[PDB]
UniProtKB/Swiss-Prot annotation, chain A:
Tissues and organs where the protein is expressed, per its UniProt entry: Highest expression in heart, brain, skeletal muscle, kidney and liver. Lower levels in placenta, lung, small intestine and leukocytes. Weak expression in colon, thymus and spleen.
GO BP of this protein: cytoskeleton organization; endocytosis; positive regulation of neuron projection development; regulation of postsynapse assembly
Protein name, UniProt field: NCK-interacting protein with SH3 domain
Known role: Has an important role in stress fiber formation induced by active diaphanous protein homolog 1 (DRF1). Induces microspike formation, in vivo. In vitro, stimulates N-WASP-induced ARP2/3 complex activation in the absence of CDC42. May play an important role in the maintenance of sarcomeres and/or in the assembly of myofibrils into sarcomeres. Implicated in regulation of actin polymerization and cell adhesion. Plays a role in angiogenesis.
Keyword Oxidoreductase annotated: no
Subunit structure: Associates with the intermediate filaments, vimentin and desmin. Binds the first and third SH3 domains of NCK. Binds the proline-rich domains of N-WASP through its SH3 domain. Similarly, binds diaphanous protein homolog 1 (DRF1). Binds the SH3 domains of GRB2 through its proline-rich domains. Interacts with Helicobacter pylori toxin vacA. Isoform 4 interacts with FHOD1. Interacts with FASLG. Interacts with TMIGD2.
Cellular localization per UniProt: Nucleus
Predominant place of localization: nucleus
Curated annotation (Swiss-Prot), chain B:
GO BP terms, alphabetized: Arp2/3 complex-mediated actin nucleation; response to estradiol; response to estrogen
Subunit structure: Component of the Arp2/3 complex composed of ACTR2/ARP2, ACTR3/ARP3, ARPC1B/p41-ARC, ARPC2/p34-ARC, ARPC3/p21-ARC, ARPC4/p20-ARC and ARPC5/p16-ARC.
Gene assigned in the entry: ARPC1B
Sample GO molecular function, one term: actin binding
Lineage: Eukaryota, Metazoa, Chordata, Craniata, Vertebrata
Known function: Component of the Arp2/3 complex, a multiprotein complex that mediates actin polymerization upon stimulation by nucleation-promoting factor (NPF). The Arp2/3 complex mediates the formation of branched actin networks in the cytoplasm, providing the force for cell motility. In addition to its role in the cytoplasmic cytoskeleton, the Arp2/3 complex also promotes actin polymerization in the nucleus, thereby regulating gene transcription and repair of damaged DNA.
Protein name: Actin-related protein 2/3 complex subunit 1B
Origin species: Homo sapiens (Human)
UniProt repeat feature WD, residue ranges: 6-45, 50-89, 94-135, 140-179, 242-280, 295-338
UniProtKB/Swiss-Prot annotation, chain C:
One Gene Ontology biological process: regulation of actin filament polymerization
Keywords: Actin-binding, Cytoplasm, Cytoskeleton, Phosphoprotein
Gene this protein is translated from: ARPC5L
InterPro entries linked: ARPC5 (IPR006789), ARPC5_sf (IPR036743)
Record PTM Phosphoserine, positions in chain: 63
Subunit structure: May be a component of the Arp2/3 complex in which it may replace ARPC5.
PANTHER family: ARP2/3 COMPLEX 16 KD SUBUNIT P16-ARC
GO CC terms: Arp2/3 protein complex; cytoplasm; extracellular exosome; focal adhesion; glutamatergic synapse
Top-level taxon of the source organism: Eukaryota
Name of the featured protein: Actin-related protein 2/3 complex subunit 5-like protein
Organism, as annotated: Homo sapiens (Human)
Primary role: May function as component of the Arp2/3 complex which is involved in regulation of actin polymerization and together with an activating nucleation-promoting factor (NPF) mediates the formation of branched actin networks.
Stored Pfam families: P16-Arc (PF04699)
Presence of keyword DNA-binding: no
Curated annotation (Swiss-Prot), chain D:
Gene name of the encoded protein: ARPC4
Places the protein is found: Cytoplasm, Cytoskeleton; Cell projection; Nucleus
Intrachain disulfide bonds: none
Cellular component aspect of the GO annotation: Arp2/3 protein complex; cell projection; cytosol; extracellular exosome; nucleus; site of double-strand break
Entry protein name: Actin-related protein 2/3 complex subunit 4
Coiled coil residues, start to end: none
């Protein structure tokens, strides 16, 4: 009745395997004794169904016990005011052992266990580590906490709302501007910051003291000039994915803190080069997790906001804008009706004509004119397809030369 | 519904003995490998190595136990089992290009080979020199011949060609048989007489089979148009254009129903009603398997009748480019498909 | 190495003057008088009033397949290709479903001929037609375009 | 200038229609085995050509046969810098045509690349995966050119800075 769940607990204990491979090992063993010994097939098929399709009453998982023991000590070591500010005993080897064990459980065990024990009592255990991180100064332990937060964001999205609304993104954004020597901590800090901002949820206003415009200039100076200690050159492609994610919850490009960074910078070229290599493929590097509701496309959200003002539009060199128009045009046509993105490329194109002198050089204007007349003459009746046509009319109405026949 | 993968490469041709105890495949090479059915296993017993080229047609005479081969090397060889080994016996086809098909006769006194030389070679035995001399039928034909099947009279011959036609010829050899009895196809049946020539001129004729009665012949084409001519109804043709990839071989399981297979990688069924005068699609036979969804993972090139003859067949065999040979049981498909009906 | 004898005999090609070359057949009865094809006034008068579905069948009823002449074929193509381009995208499934099998195959023949020489927007329509006729006729419809020895 | 989903849906269906192939020995030479679409000695074995096209420039040509298929393709080249990068890319793809077994070392006239698929590829290789390579090619080629146009423009800046910086 409950065999398939009581075996997985036995196997994970005495082998250390993950949840997935625990089910594989049993499905293979059973599925092979069933075939070699047909006399046992009725018993085996019940056993397989228990896997495909709960635990006994008092029996509690091993991974659930450990998370009661780990979250309880780390919160006890947080509430130990003496040992934190006035150290006497050694703590780096014990804490490093509980945080390693935690990272192997969140990474391998069943997510629904690791979800409830983190969602328990209104995220009491998550929010402690977020404070212990603020309290701890040792980078050997700040690094393991980041690897643990990155595993908790993959489980649920309610945890992301808990972290982004907390003080974590303000300490990372403060440790990165200050402690630039540690390369791993600077590269993981920029990963977690992109995780928690991935969903587009808003944040307290107080975060913008350390996540505002001076933090963007710091990230642009790294994207453009790089660091000396960055030998492998991972950090520019992480400080790009982070800027794309900060700009997700930020509305009203005129009021945007990031765009004030671009318009203040002397010359951005490497940040613009990288935005187009992402647009050519239509890949959202911020979208690491498969959590609903799926937020918008981070790149187009950015470029829609770049071209929401003419001060930020002039960052693109001449050769790059023409490559941006060749791409946007190619996607508008290659995309099918009923897609969500087609109005984004259209709204993006509408933003280019306003804030740039597109009507003086008119690059790919004939190929564009033929595509908009098609989209208006499309007889589709979905609501989304009516939103596209609604944009095109506004685009042609504002600029008439986009409605004329190609010539 | 078996499936034994003899190899990974194609199987150009196959033939069964009388007992269906042994099978002679060509594993896409110059050799004929004879496998025997040991219980639920398949064991190779012989290998025939005389061809300078690839083999395209094999037939096994059931009574005499004499295998005949045809290959791209413009050769044929009649094999006789002397003791424990097969020994060949030479053939004189007199063709300037390669061969494509071969079929033993019912009475095992002749065979017919279809070639790319725009001919058909009616071969018979000559003990004066131990040769098998051949006579030609190349009056109307204009291109390669792909398939053949013998009438039960041991004289009349059907031939599917790449000229888009399925002609029917009279392979009467005076030296080895007396003049035949008449037939609804015609009385005047001397050597090399075009009795019936189809009308359609679109698509290559891949397969041809006579009916057990001898009064019905069907042919498959690359146009996805199965056909069937009835002599009782003044040689009228009934087509059934399919909505899938073409077929490459057919056979009469009964006097009314057929079974075809080809590039769709499974068999199907076709039903004929002489009252209405048309064909009808009897549905796919093999159930969709629980990308491809069948046993044959590539095309099928040859279909054969093991048990029950063409009069009423209980088991038929499929042989395909996927190095496989699948035996089918007809009644098992009747049961496993309650909708399925075999007329 | 190199040769120093006249090797010009290997240049002339004798295979051109051959007697075994293939010869396909044609309709003798059509060489004298060709099939008139869909008359423009018939279809057009049905297009003025907007009766597309009947101008549709009028164009597929007549088709000069047996004709050896190419102009009447070209005129016939421009007529039907003029008709398919004026359809309403929602009405196409309504029209394709009406046709029998032998009209779907003749349709797909004309479709694969419209792709040869396209106008500005002749092909975005024909790809929609191609989707419907394939949903009805399947791959076997296309095979009767490839195997067809007589063009539309 | 129509859409990309139906185009590849039409091409994919025509290809399954034309990869219905089988071996076939020659009837003009003694024991040759050639792809008849290339030699074109036997008219009866040559199916019709059929064309597909989003527009005037982009199109596909499937010349089928009993034992061969030829799939010529034309790619869109808006500007001159894209005509160059596509011309070179095919040359570097044709040079490795012994590794792309379904490839021609030169393209058909009027087209940018041409495939050739014999009856020995379907027997050995997976027929449904070969189609997926042609289709995967036709939708990635546009991305792999603009990624080079952007890479040429990025190089041209550094070559300018490394000269003007020294002033």
């Amino acid at each position: 009745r409950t065999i398939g769940a009581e075996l997985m607990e036995l196997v994970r204990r005495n082998t250390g395997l993950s949840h997935e491979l625990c089910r594989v090992a049993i499905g293979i063993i059973v599925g092979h004794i069933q075939a070699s010994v047909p006399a046992s097939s009725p018993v085996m098929e019940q056993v397989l169904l228990s896997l495909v399709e709960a635990l006994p009453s008092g029996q509690v998982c091993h991974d659930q016990q450990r998370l009661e023991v780990i979250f309880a000590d780390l919160a006890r070591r947080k509430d130990d005011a003496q040992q934190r500010s006035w150290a006497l005993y050694e703590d780096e080897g014990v804490i490093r052992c509980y945080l390693e064990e935690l990272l192997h459980i969140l990474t391998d065990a069943d997510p629904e266990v690791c979800k409830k024990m983190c969602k328990r009592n209104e995220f009491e255990s998550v929010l402690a580590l977020v404070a212990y991180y603020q309290m701890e100064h040792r980078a050997s332990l700040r690094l393991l906490l980041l690897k643990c937060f990155g595993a908790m964001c993959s489980l649920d999205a309610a945890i992301i709302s808990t972290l982004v609304s907390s003080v974590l993104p303000v300490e990372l954004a403060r440790d990165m501007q200050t402690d630039t020597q540690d390369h791993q901590k600077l590269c993981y800090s920029a990963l977690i910051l992109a995780m928690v901002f991935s969903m587009g949820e808003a944040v307290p206003y107080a975060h913008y003291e350390h996540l505002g415009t001076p933090f963007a200039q710091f990230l642009l100076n790294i994207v453009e000039d790089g660091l000396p200690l960055d030998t492998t050159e991972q950090l520019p492609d992480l400080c790009v994915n982070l800027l794309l994610a900060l700009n997700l919850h930020l509305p009203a490009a005129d009021q945007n803190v990031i765009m004030a960074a671009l318009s203040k910078h002397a010359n951005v070229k490497i940040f613009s080069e990288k935005l187009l290599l992402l647009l050519n493929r239509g890949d959202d590097p911020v979208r690491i997790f498969k959590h609903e509701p799926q937020p918008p496309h981070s790149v187009l959200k950015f470029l829609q906001d770049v071209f929401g003002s003419p001060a930020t539009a002039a960052i693109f060199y001449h050769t790059d804008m023409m490559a941006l128009i060749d791409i946007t045009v190619r996607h508008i046509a290659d995309l099918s009706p009923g897609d969500k993105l087609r109005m984004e490329y259209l709204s993006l194109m509408h933003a280019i004509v306003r804030t740039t002198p597109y009507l003086q050089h008119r690059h790919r204007l004939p190929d564009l004119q033929a595509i908009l007349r098609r989209i208006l003459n499309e007889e589709e009746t979905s609501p989304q397809c009516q939103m596209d046509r609604m944009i095109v009319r506004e685009m042609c109405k504002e600029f008439l030369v986009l409605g004329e026949a190609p010539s | 519904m078996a499936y034994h993968s003899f190899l990974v490469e194609p199987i150009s041709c196959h033939a069964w003995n009388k007992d269906r105890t042994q099978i002679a495949i060509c594993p896409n090479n110059h050799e004929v490998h004879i496998y025997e059915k040991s219980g639920a296993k398949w064991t190779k017993v012989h290998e025939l190595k005389e061809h300078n080229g690839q083999v395209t047609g094999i037939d096994w005479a059931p009574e005499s136990n004499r295998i005949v081969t045809c290959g791209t090397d413009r050769n044929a060889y009649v094999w006789t089992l002397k003791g424990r080994t097969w020994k060949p016996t030479l053939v004189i086809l007199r063709i300037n290009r390669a061969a494509r098909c071969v079929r033993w006769a019912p009475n095992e006194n002749k065979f017919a080979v279809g070639s790319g030389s725009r001919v058909i070679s009616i071969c018979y035995f000559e003990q004066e020199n131990d040769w098998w001399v051949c006579k030609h039928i190349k009056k109307p034909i204009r291109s390669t011949v792909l398939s053949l099947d013998w009438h039960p009279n041991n004289v009349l011959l059907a031939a599917g060609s790449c000229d888009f036609k399925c002609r029917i010829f009279s392979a009467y050899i005076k030296e080895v048989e007396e003049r035949p009895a008449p037939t609804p196809w015609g009385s005047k049946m001397p050597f090399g007489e075009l009795m019936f020539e189809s009308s359609s001129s679109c698509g290559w004729v891949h397969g041809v089979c006579f009916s057990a009665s001898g009064s019905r012949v069907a042919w498959v084409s690359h146009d996805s148009t199965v056909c069937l001519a009835d002599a009782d109804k003044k040689m009228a043709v009934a087509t059934l254009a399919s909505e899938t990839l073409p077929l490459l071989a057919l056979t009469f399981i009964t006097d009314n129903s057929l079974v075809a297979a080809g590039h769709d990688c499974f068999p199907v069924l076709f039903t004929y009603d002489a009252a209405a005068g048309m064909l009808s699609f009897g549905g796919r036979l093999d159930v969709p398997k629980q990308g491809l969804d069948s046993l044959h993972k590539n095309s099928v090139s040859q279909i054969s009748v093991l048990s029950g003859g063409k009069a009423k067949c209980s088991q038929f065999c499929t042989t395909g480019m996927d190095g496989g040979m699948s035996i089918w049981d007809v009644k098992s498909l009747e049961s496993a498909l309650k909708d399925l009906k075999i007329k | 190495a190199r040769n120093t004898l006249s090797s010009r005999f290997r240049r002339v090609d004798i295979d051109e003057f051959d007697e075994n070359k293939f010869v396909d057949e044609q309709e003798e009865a059509a060489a004298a008088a060709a099939e008139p094809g869909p008359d423009p006034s018939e279809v057009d008068g049905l297009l003025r009033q907007g009766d597309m579905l009947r101008a549709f069948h009028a164009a597929l009823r007549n088709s000069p397949v047996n004709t050896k002449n190419q102009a009447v074929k070209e005129r016939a193509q421009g007529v039907v290709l003029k008709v398919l381009t004026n359809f309403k995208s929602s009405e196409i499934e309504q029209a394709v479903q009406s046709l029998d099998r032998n009209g779907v195959d003749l349709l797909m023949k004309y479709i694969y001929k419209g792709f040869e020489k396209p106008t500005e927007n002749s092909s975005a329509v024909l790809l929609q037609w191609h989707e419907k006729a394939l949903a009805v006729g399947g791959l076997g419809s296309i095979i009767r375009v490839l195997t067809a020895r007589k063009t539309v | 200038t129509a859409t990309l989903r139906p185009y590849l849906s039409a091409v994919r269906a025509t290809l399954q229609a034309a990869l219905c192939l089988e071996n076939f020995s020659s009837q003009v030479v003694e024991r040759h085995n050639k792809p008849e679409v290339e030699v074109r000695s036997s008219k009866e074995l040559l199916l019709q050509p059929v064309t597909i096209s989003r527009n005037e420039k982009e199109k596909v040509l499937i010349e089928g046969s009993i034992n061969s298929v030829r799939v010529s393709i034309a790619v869109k080249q808006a500007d001159e810098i894209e005509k160059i990068l596509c011309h070179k890319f095919m040359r570097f793809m044709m040079m490795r045509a012994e590794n792309f077994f379904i490839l021609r070392r030169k393209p058909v006239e009027g087209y940018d690349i041409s495939f050739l698929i014999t009856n020995f590829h379907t027997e050995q290789m997976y027929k449904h995966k070969l189609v997926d390579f042609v289709i995967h090619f036709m939708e990635e080629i546009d991305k792999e050119i603009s990624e080079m146009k952007l890479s040429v423009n990025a190089r041209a800046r550094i070559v300018a800075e490394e000269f003007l910086k020294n002033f």
